Amino acid sequence: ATIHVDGKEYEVNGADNLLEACLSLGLDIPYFCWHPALGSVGACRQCAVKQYQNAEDTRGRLVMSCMTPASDGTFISIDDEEAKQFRESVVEWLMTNHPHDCPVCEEGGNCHLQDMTVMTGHSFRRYRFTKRTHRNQDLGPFISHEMNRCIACYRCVRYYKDYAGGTDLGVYGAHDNVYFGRPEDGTLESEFSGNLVEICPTGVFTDKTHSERYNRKWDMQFAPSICQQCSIGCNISPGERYGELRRIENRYNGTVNHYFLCDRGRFGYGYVNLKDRPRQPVQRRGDDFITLNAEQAMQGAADILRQSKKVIGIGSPRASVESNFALRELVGEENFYTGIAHGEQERLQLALKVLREGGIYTPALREIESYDAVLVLGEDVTQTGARVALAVRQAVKGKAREMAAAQKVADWQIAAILNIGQRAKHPLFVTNVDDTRLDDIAAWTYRAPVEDQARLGFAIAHALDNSAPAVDGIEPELQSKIDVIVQALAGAKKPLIISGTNAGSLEVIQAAANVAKALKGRGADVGITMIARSVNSMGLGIMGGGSLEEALTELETGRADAVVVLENDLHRHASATRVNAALAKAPLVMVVDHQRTAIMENAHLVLSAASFAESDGTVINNEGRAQRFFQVYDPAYYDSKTVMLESWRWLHSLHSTLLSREVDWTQLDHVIDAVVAKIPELAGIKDAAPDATFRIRGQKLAREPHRYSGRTAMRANISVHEPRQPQDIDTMFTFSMEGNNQPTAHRSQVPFAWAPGWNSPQAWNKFQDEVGGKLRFGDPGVRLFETSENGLDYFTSVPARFQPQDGKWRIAPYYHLFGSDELSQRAPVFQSRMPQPYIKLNPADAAKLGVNAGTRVSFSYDGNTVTLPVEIAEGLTAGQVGLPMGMSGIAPVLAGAHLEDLKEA
């Protein structure tokens, strides 16, 4: 289209509204109620411009640019005097009841309302009457509520209800006593409730975890990092202050996680700030624990490892690609073991083979929202891959979007879209062992064991294409529902099949691959999505190695007399008794880790590794996208005794001291080159981010804002003399404000969004090519593998129907967003949020046991009798017992395992 703003001609997209079109061009219009992801509703009346009918028009008419289409030949004025006066009047009207709270408000220096009060040029108060007040609610451990600061812009309810699909946050009241929140005091029940701290343009919803240890945005040291809490790979901006990780902000990535995180990623960073973390290398001597520095630890470890006959390495899917590679180089390729179980590795390798050899395009997380039908097999996505559940909700609302687009309604006029699409939605069919959080929008939910879910998948695949193997023994009503799913998937233009390794079944992944292959054979634009478990599960699967059980056999038979365990607690992937026996048998255990794990009691040496906030590296997400995370701060800057290096740096210097008796603290890019030389499948991690020599017109990229304060008093209690600025040789960022963070800088890795005039998270509008689209100069991260030219074959291994036998209880996995990820469990704010561990029983099974809801039952697994209180699960099938995977004592390896001797305690 063509628009004329203030006498200047611009070419904009005609499907856009005027506000987003003018913001994409760089024109500043104040706005409150509009958000790029939520659409336009025209509530706050802040985006007013003057629209003229033609070129020779003088009167004009005040319109809302968010509700006005950017049609061809549209004449508007932003800086007209009447429009400026109206926008200042709207700011003043918002200011009449606003509290005098900015010094004691967590959004100060980060507030969109502050920025728009300054931007409209309103600074003189002529209102003299009383301000309306409100009482706050308790919204739980994560979100603090302060309703005085509300400007009644409806962003919270629109996000939480229309976008996020939550049900416990609404708008109550009337004329100007509108209230936003829950109907009663209680925890917000959404898994994406934490995005309210950035959706809300004021200080109503604030990060309570950040509020307990608060600092302003200009005092933060930010870095671009990848969330380490699950496999999706959402980009985050961790900000630190005084040596501790203070906040996780969302980092925009138009390909992956655009504006939104989940609550696990946003609030489960508190393990970094624990006081029991290793901070120096510790070597045991009898009963003593001697603290070493870096070089003494490397020399002693090199001597003992040189004397040992065979040293094996146990990696982890928590560690980065560089750290696992460095361990593999230290111990050798044949002595490197992926520190996960054999069944877990088999499911991970099958998921990898489906993704990079199945010939079906695996979509990015934002691309999920454009699919016309979703079949989720076995994966409880909301508790394991939550951002995919949010994207699936958007893809489900796509039918209302399509219906409104048929009636010539613009795609941003969201209220009319939801009016036209009342309850019509695209088909969603979820299968799980029990009820999911997607059941409120699913067209059908199948509560069944993993064998029965896999059989349903194979039956869908056979009914879509007869070349697929058939399933014998399908009930007629179940066959009718199979036919419903087949009619929905065959009529879809873009069907999506989501499975994962969290169901604990190989056959669920095989059935999902069969459905995707059958839909590909019919010519549909099908996509497949596997959900892995940990941050670098896909990278550890690509690198490969033996299972944890093989390494345990090597240690137990005596063939390995030295083990290096990298970032693996080893109890989540194998039985704790066997791990303890094998590690006590081994005459040398060396644990490179950043969290105090239980195996450190058996360790001869403990190397204090860095977490993601104190290390750089690369991780591979569930779609195969290599992503670089950068170090946020130097741990040695505030405490000089802290020796907390990267895991790859520890292992590389150990390898150097083992070979040549000299210590080599390498650089990150050297390790990257070594990975892309030794492992050709991981050759794409070179392009994930530029190297340390990258400059923006000669200067590095800044980790902290220009107004960073306290630079001559933040360490003045230790010494009045300022220390050296920490040198970053690994990456292209600098540990100071002496760098570049311009929005128009030719880079993809943005540590934080800030532009002059835009201090809020709405500053991301300046950093994108168009608002709500891709990041300017591309999103960071590259896909490792392309879609294969030819696909797999049909998996003919159809499992039998699940049969409950007496005295054997199949463990059904129940994942929790707060409590199934290990480092998240370590975060102290999740202790108040995670549920008490309940063992789920069918009513018939509990009646057979005589057990009621709440009586503690004991069960023996691996010769360990553990007791849990019983919760009655109606949707669970008989013969199965539900267990919370990942929590205290219950490892995720138990998913799908049998249970013996389940009696009342």
Add this chain to the structure above:
Amino acid sequence: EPAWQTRDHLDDPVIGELRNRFGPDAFTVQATRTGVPVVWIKREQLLEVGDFLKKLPKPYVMLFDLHGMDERLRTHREGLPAADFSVFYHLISIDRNRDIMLKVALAENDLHVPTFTKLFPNANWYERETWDLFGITFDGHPNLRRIMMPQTWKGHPLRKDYPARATEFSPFELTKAKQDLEMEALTFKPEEWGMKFMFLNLGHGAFRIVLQLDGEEIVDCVPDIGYHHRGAEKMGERQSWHSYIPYTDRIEYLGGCVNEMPYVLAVEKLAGITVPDRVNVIRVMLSELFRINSHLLYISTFIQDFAFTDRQKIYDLVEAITGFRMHPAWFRIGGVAHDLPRGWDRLLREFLDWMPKRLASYEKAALQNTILKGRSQGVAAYGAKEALEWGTTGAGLRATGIDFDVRKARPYSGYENFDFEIPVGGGVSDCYTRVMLKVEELRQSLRILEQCLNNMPEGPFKADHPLTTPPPKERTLQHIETLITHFLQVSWGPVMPANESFQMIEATKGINSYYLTSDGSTMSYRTRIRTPSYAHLQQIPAAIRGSLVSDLIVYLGSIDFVMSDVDR
């Protein structure tokens, strides 16, 4: 029509003359808030344009400034030629009472400009400093060496990719610098310094001059400056618009509010702030108090080559108003920090009832002391031709008979409302003539203070503009809009929309000027400070040739320079 408005100056006759001479496509006119025509000239036509402007019917006779600029990070380059670097030449015509700024664009790899020292001899030090801080080579320059840095310095500190902060201190570099400086008197090379007879080093401020003597006659002298370089402009790029005012204070430290004035006027041009009349009167009053203080110190120092009680009276008055003696840091964007305290008029009235007798005593100590007349007249004198070509401003320029004062020619801060005379010398800049001009300027400043005291506006001390930084404190303490504005202005900084501004004022030593480039941010993209002590110190080797070393000492005492003003 506002005086801060973005103008193009296409109605300037110099633009039409340049169009008639070089053609309409030979240059690009830039619309700024500097108040002068900004003309982008091709690099090859630079000497032709300099020749043309030097030979106009009312010619441009003084190169006011010459400096570089790193354009690699400037995002708002609309209506500008494609430049990685630029060099701006600020030229002043006194007959027209106008000025022009010629900008030459440069690519990043081809950083060399023709020298301007054939047209304006004072361009020598400016081109040396532009080479030193930007790495811009000047072809044809005689000795293009570092003037603010030691010769063993790596990189150019005003480039955008240079770290502003102090690096780690090392005793090894200190010992190396001790070996370099302390072997200079033994291994002196008389060709690096531009010279070609004994060599002496001397060792207002502490600075070194390398002297070449025939007996006691000075046949060549090369000053060595940069020993007091504080990096004030690089700090201008590091502080916000508000939290840079103390740094403006700490340049020409005897000036104080005089040094604050051009910075805040340039920022107010950037912000579009027209300050009310009481603000203008307050800033004029404090600048005149500090001008009297500086003139008293200069006269007392020259008479030495009793007067320190009047300086204490001025310091007590400034202490009562601002809270601080010599670095008040009191002018704000759009006003001053506080209102005048209740009782200021009594202190000013007691000061103005004390000064006429002291001024009569100074005139008796300077006129009737005929020994000082004999030992001051004819001591390193120069005419108007030497004053124009070396950029000499202030008392020396007006002692050469050129009636050019900024407070009258280009009035600022409401100096039009005050009736005061401009003392003009006979046509020769002696030490004695400059001291007499300082005495008469002191009398005129006392007249300005009397006119301030008798007619004082009752009104606001801060403007009613949204970019007034900080807002008035009581409204900050009880209004949420004002609190928000205060919060964002003192933390992130006030946002000046992308423009270039220039303010030139009459300082206590000459003409001081700020040239600010904003890229639309809360900090300055470029801060250029032109100080008169730089141009006064460049003129010493042009005036002390063939004179005695005692004449050099008297001339140094009569220049009225400060070394922090030199090295800015």
Add this chain to the structure above:
Amino acid sequence: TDFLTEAHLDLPMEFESIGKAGSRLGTALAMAVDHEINMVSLVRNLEEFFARESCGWCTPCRDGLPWSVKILRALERGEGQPGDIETLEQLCRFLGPGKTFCAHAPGAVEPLQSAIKYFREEFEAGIKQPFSNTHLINGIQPNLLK
């Protein structure tokens, strides 16, 4: 609907005739106000109704009708301050058609602007105290704007 005076009483009750007089025909159910009813009190009651029957969706109605209500209460009590009538006039100009999300607020500000147009003397009679928005803080000299 806008108030009309007795000079407008000789006017046909059509849409265009009432519209060209500076009002709306509306429901054509006229209400007659006699002399002893104070215009400020009547408009205060009307604006209280309109500001409590707001739906709260859009900022000008939700946050600008209560400001007019408070100003009219001050003018009722004789506690009006200079600039209050200007604030009411600016509210009438900025709550017109298209400025607010629906037509509740234009219909709300029609009686206010019509009563200001025809009965300005009573609103000016409501203003009886000087404009004070701040209080003096001991230790800070105020910015005496002119």
